Curated annotation (Swiss-Prot):
This is DNA repair protein complementing XP-A cells. The modification Phosphoserine is found at residue 37. The lineage of its organism: Eukaryota, Metazoa, Chordata, Craniata, Vertebrata. ATR-dependent phosphorylation of XPA at Ser-37 is important for cell survival in response to UV damage. Ubiquitinated by HERC2 leading to degradation by the proteasome. The gene is XPA. Expressed in various cell lines and in skin fibroblasts. It is found in: Nucleus.
Length: 57
DNA sequence: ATATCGCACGTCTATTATCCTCAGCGCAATCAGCTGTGACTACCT
């Protein structure tokens, strides 16, 4: 299902607020569904940072 | 004839509300990967 969000003005200045906020539980559930497991997500972020280091070098 | 009031001529000081440089989120610059065209260079059995 689509994930809803709340457009809440930032507690800081009125410079550019109106930030979107999502429920943490829904985001975690969606991430687990997409990636299968938390270990897969950890491996994905590790290989992403490794690729970032490879690209910068 | 000499001090004295009206008028003027300025000048010092102020009972009082302005212009600079740090913040998420979405559209655009960037990049790795892959492939296509052409000739080249070479290497094994």
């Amino acid at each position: 299902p689509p994930l809803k969000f709340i457009v809440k003005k930032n507690p800081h200045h009125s410079q550019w607020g109106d930030m979107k906020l999502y429920l943490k539980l829904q985001i975690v559930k969606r991430s687990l569904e997409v990636w299968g497991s938390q270990e897969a997500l950890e491996e994905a972020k590790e290989v992403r940072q490794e690729n970032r280091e490879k690209m910068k070098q």
